[PDB]
Design a binder for this molecule. Structure first.
Ligand SMILES: Nc1ncnc2c1ncn2[C@@H]1O[C@H](COP(=O)(O)OP(=O)(O)OP(O)(O)=S)[C@@H](O)[C@H]1O
Lengths: 160, 184
């Protein structure tokens, strides 16, 4: 009888963050089966006693990933201030978040987002993200000049 | 009549002789557990007002710290000379503030020995947060958490700290309690 660990260990996600893998924190498939969690499904990741954060369940390689380790794209770790070695509490979600109607997007240093980067690349990142809660970061974003790193934080999202 | 706190009766309209009275309390012979009030503990006015502030800030206006962001004062230590009225003030806060009072911690706990008591305590602070704005009193905080003079300890002191570090969550979410200690 396989034993489900009570607390999982946060670790890097060797895959890049620019892709559609923002909230698709890869989880060891054995844990996915042992917790009645379907692939590509939403589940709550959070530190012990804290309110949960939403991640999408995606199956990883059994051999490479040990059982405890949960891999997060660096965009979502910054949502709930998840620093490495933070013990988590995986639980199964039950409500699908509704779509978005308005999003107010921030920046690290107040740089004019209109003037520095295209709306198309920002929209690409945001769409490929899929589910957006207020607090992530999209890092290492190539700008129009190609020599500037500006990070897209998200201040708020409102549904009408 | 058995176990009734005061003699009950059934109202039936028309057959009952209703009468007015200026009396602010029920018949004294009912031996009721009469409320406790600030009209009784008066004599410490300024600290009463400060206590009222310390109940305003964590019960009524926790939202008003989400803006301004800064960590709130969500632990109170009502110290003073023995017999000065500390337990009476805690009792008046409990009955005249309309928060939910999480049960008194007390010197007593299941076993009063480390390991066993560590879970039995955390349960009291786990009961906190879920209920609408509350107040967990830890009276006699010197008897539950003594000084550790040179080596006198079970685990209870560090257990209180480790639990208070989660009880201090609030005003971002679950800002629905304050802790008031008393000591001599
Ligand atoms: N207005 C008053 N102010 C202060 N004490 C009063 C007052 N009226 C009556 N007393 C009584 O003074 C006694 C004070 O006892 P406590 O409040 O239990 O003492 P205390 O300050 O809590 O000391 P301990 O050692 O910490 S239990 C109670 O019996 C009160 O009812």
């Amino acid at each position: 009888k396989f034993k489900l660990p009570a607390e999982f260990i946060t670790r890097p996600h060797p895959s890049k963050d620019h892709g559609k893998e923002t909230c698709t924190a890869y989880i060891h498939p054995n844990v996915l089966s042992s917790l009645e969690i379907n692939p590509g499904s939403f589940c709550t990741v959070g530190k012990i006693g804290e309110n949960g954060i939403l991640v999408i369940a995606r199956a990883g390689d059994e051999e490479v990933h040990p059982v405890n380790v949960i891999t997060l794209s660096t965009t979502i770790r910054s949502v709930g201030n998840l620093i490495l070695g933070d013990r988590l509490e995986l639980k199964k979600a039950q409500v699908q978040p509704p779509y978005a109607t308005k999003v107010t997007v921030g920046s690290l240093q107040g740089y004019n987002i209109l003037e520095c980067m295209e709306e198309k690349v920002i929209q690409k990142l945001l769409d490929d993200s899929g589910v957006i809660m207020p607090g992530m970061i999209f890092q290492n974003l190539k700008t129009k000049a190609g020599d500037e790193s500006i990070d897209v934080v998200i201040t708020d999202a409102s549904d009408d | 009549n058995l176990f009734y706190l005061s003699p009950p009766f059934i109202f039936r309209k028309g057959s009952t002789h209703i009468t007015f009275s200026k009396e602010t309390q029920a018949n004294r012979k009912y031996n009721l557990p009469e409320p406790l009030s600030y009209a009784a503990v008066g004599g410490l006015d300024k600290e009463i007002e400060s206590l009222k502030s310390a109940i305003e800030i964590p019960l009524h206006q926790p939202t008003l710290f989400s803006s301004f962001g800064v960590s709130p004062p969500r632990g109170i230590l009502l110290h003073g000379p023995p017999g000065t009225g500390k337990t009476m003030l805690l009792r008046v806060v409990a009955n005249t503030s309309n928060a939910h009072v999480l049960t008194i911690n007390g010197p007593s706990i299941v076993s009063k020995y480390l390991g066993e008591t560590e879970a039995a305590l955390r349960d009291i602070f786990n009961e906190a947060r879920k209920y609408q704005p509350s107040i967990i009193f830890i009276d006699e905080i010197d008897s539950i958490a003594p000084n550790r003079a040179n080596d006198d300890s079970g685990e209870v002191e560090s257990r209180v700290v480790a639990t208070l570090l989660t009880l201090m969550d609030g005003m971002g979410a679950a800002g629905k309690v304050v802790v008031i200690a008393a000591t001599n």
